[PDB]
Design a protein around this ligand. Structure first.
Ligand SMILES: Nc1nc2c(ncn2[C@@H]2O[C@H](COP(=O)(O)CP(=O)(O)OP(=O)(O)O)[C@@H](O)[C@H]2OP(=O)(O)OC[C@H]2O[C@@H](n3cnc4c(N)ncnc43)[C@H](O)[C@@H]2O)c(=O)[nH]1
Ligand SMILES: Nc1nc2c(ncn2[C@@H]2O[C@H](COP(=O)(O)CP(=O)(O)OP(=O)(O)O)[C@@H](O)[C@H]2OP(=O)(O)OC[C@H]2O[C@@H](n3cnc4c(N)ncnc43)[C@H](O)[C@@H]2O)c(=O)[nH]1
Ligand SMILES: [Mg+2]
Ligand SMILES: [Mg+2]
Ligand SMILES: [Mg+2]
Ligand SMILES: [Zn+2]
Ligand SMILES: [Zn+2]
Lengths: 340, 352
DNA sequence: ATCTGTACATGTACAGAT
DNA sequence: ATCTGTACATGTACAGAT
DNA sequence: ATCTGTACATGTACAGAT
DNA sequence: ATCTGTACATGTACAGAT
């Protein structure tokens, strides 16, 4: 079934162990260098985010996301247009706090430190505009990416654009939501302008992934297992496979699928609506939801409701119809792409 | 119905507001006086516990429980004869209470009590005295006349941040109800020790402390569902707390009429219902529409505890609150007859 | 001048009041 | 159904201390 | 302030039971 | 084939020591 696919996607203990040991060496070293120097990033703290740390990494342990976040007292935001997600922001003297200038110095430091590593085969990938990350390419056994993500940490209440976000009230509840919104919020230097930062809720997304049930015992050793994470794996795999074959899908990414499933988990809050016995129905209903997002050109950021990830401005109508045909096809033919 | 009883039991906002305003003044003042330097209790922090703070206080807001707890870093416990709940404490602002390396409960309580009495004398704004010391209490109890009687128990507590004592390893069996993450997190919170302060005449009388988990009990009362939305504004209401109120009321009413029941206390009913909440973890087994069944099944459980002389501390499984050594079988049979009677005759005592 | 333990400012769940 | 007082958790301002 | 030790949740691998 | 129990591996929060 889709069970055999999940078997293939399942990471191996051996591989996890080998990847993690190399990754931690490099990260531990980068993190130390940010402290030890008369460095403007002294104080930066490490936060592990994304799939591997959410336990929804598929295929291989080869992509790791780490936040190097820095406490910045009493900063003042100004929303960059009515975009909801992008802001100007107001030790760091030489960086309005310019995202690009801060990222550059951060990146310079990392590059320098990477040169000094003689026990691991590791380089710094050429910069992509649009990435807030300094990406490391590690080879030692085989290929592993590590994104080192610079983040400002603010302790204020979250910005107004998120007031109506995180609609978990009927699923995870009001106490969970109030507590989550008492955690700090993050600003990440995302930039295709050079002074614009972007809100990040990776920390919150991680908590949700690991506390995802309406029952406190969902997926615990004295609870019942659900198939919420397995659906997310399957959906991510369908996208990766399609994306590797079709250049038309360059504008799509796994965050789109993650956002979609957060909305489905809200819409279907009950653990019994994600029974492992109903993996197919569950996967199928997720596809149907994703297709509706494509058809209506609408997939709101889960934390920032006015920010449409499927706006015309971000992803072209044709790209959306293209992905629809390809999903509808896979869906109506037993997912041939799951075999390749 | 039982609904009409709960109507009577429901506290009133007016009463809550008047009681709370006076109580907080007194407590805030006592807490400040503890913080004056060359007080052995400098550092003590306030923790509100018990019914009122659990929202299961019934009838009137006239009893408040407050913990004045003090962090004591380097701590060695010694269990008092395999009892599970009682300990000597060992190893400084506390210098004067030490007998060799042993922290004297009674000496510490006495000084605490002396301070409080002194501070209470200086309050001319509120009518408040210190109740005569009751054997077995870790508390300095304040009697306030707000033209209404209000008790405040100020409970002296040691706070240890270490892992909880081994006697609790098998306690707090919430795994199938609240879950493993909740349990792990709760067990990462500190544990508390309060003076046992018995007047029996047994060895180590004045140096024996007792474990308290009031802080944990509070969290459970306010996060009591298998669903995170139990009793929230986008969830379904349960009758878990309402059963606890009803059971508490049946005991209070009986206790106020019968001296035979002096050995019984509300903690017995609280412990019983914690076991029932574990046994029946699903929110749907505490549907408000099934209040009678729910109340009835709790009574039946409590009666079985009385008949078999067994009600294990929820946190300390080997400590039987209904042992022969604590409460007489005759006392237990007496309470059984009275409950069985109320149960089989429309609860006439709810009408008094 | 800088630092800080204390108290205030802000936000919301719970439950009672309307 | 909507409104409201209390309790509680977290952030931040500041007179008195250094 | 940084570091380590402890405890346990979330995983995977595999054998015996169903 | 699926479930259950055990073993083995990693991540992560926090307390006590330095
Ligand atoms: N993390 C993240 N990615 C986002 C966001 N908005 C769009 N994206 C893009 O979606 C993809 C997801 O990348 P990740 O690997 O981080 C997500 P995962 O849960 O680990 O899942 P898989 O590893 O299984 O896929 C990427 O293509 C994102 O493109 P990008 O935004 O340029 O990401 C570049 C890298 O920088 C980090 N990063 C990006 N956005 C953020 C963010 N908001 N907060 C923190 N880190 C971020 C990350 O390492 C990424 O790989 C979005 O909000 N978050
Ligand atoms: N809390 C508590 N009480 C216990 C315990 N073992 C016996 N008791 C006695 O039961 C009664 C319940 O006292 P509370 O008022 O704290 C319980 P509530 O949920 O607030 O319910 P109501 O206020 O609606 O009744 C008391 O009579 C206890 O008597 P005690 O134990 O001799 O102590 C007298 C007072 O001291 C405080 N106190 C008692 N035990 C503790 C404790 N373990 N931790 C902290 N404070 C405690 C309390 O103020 C009591 O009134 C037991 O384990 N817990
Ligand atoms: Mg990733
Ligand atoms: Mg990544
Ligand atoms: Mg009391
Ligand atoms: Zn689950
Ligand atoms: Zn409830």
């Amino acid at each position: 079934k889709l069970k055999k696919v999940l078997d293939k996607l399942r990471l191996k203990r051996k591989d996890i162990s080998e990847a993690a040991e190399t990754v931690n060496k490099v990260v531990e070293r980068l993190l130390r260098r940010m402290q030890k120097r008369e460095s403007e990033f002294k104080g930066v703290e490490q936060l592990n985010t994304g799939s591997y740390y959410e336990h929804v990494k598929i295929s291989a342990p080869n992509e790791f996301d780490v936040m190097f976040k820095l406490e910045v007292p009493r900063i003042e935001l100004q929303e960059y247009y009515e975009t909801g997600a992008f802001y100007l922001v107001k030790p760091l003297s030489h960086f309005v706090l310019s995202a690009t200038k801060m990222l550059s110095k951060f990146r310079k430091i990392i590059k320098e430190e990477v040169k000094e590593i003689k026990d691991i085969d590791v380089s710094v990938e050429k910069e992509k505009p649009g990435s807030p990350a300094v990406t490391l390419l590690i080879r030692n056994p085989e290929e592993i990416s590590v994104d080192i993500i610079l983040a400002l940490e603010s302790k204020g209440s979250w910005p107004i654009s998120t007031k109506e976000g995180l609609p978990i009230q009927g699923w995870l509840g009001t106490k969970v939501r109030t507590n989550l919104r008492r955690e700090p919020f993050y600003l990440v230097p995302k930039n295709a302008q050079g002074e614009t930062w972007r809100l990040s809720f990776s920390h919150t997304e991680k908590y949700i992934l690991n506390n995802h049930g309406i029952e406190k015992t969902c997926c615990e050793s004295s609870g019942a297992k659900c198939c919420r994470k397995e659906c997310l794996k399957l959906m991510k795999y369908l996208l990766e496979q399609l994306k590797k074959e079709f250049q038309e899908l360059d504008a799509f990414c796994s965050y789109h699928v993650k956002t979609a499933i957060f909305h489905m988990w809200t819409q279907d809050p009950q653990d019994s609506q994600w029974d492992p016995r109903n993996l197919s129905s569950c996967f199928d209903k997720l596809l149907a939801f994703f297709l509706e997002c494509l058809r209506t050109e609408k997939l709101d950021h889960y934390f920032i409701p006015k920010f449409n990830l499927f706006s015309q401005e971000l992803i072209d109508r044709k790209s959306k119809e293209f992905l629809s045909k390809k999903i509808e096809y896979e869906r109506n033919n037993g997912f041939p792409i799951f075999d390749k």
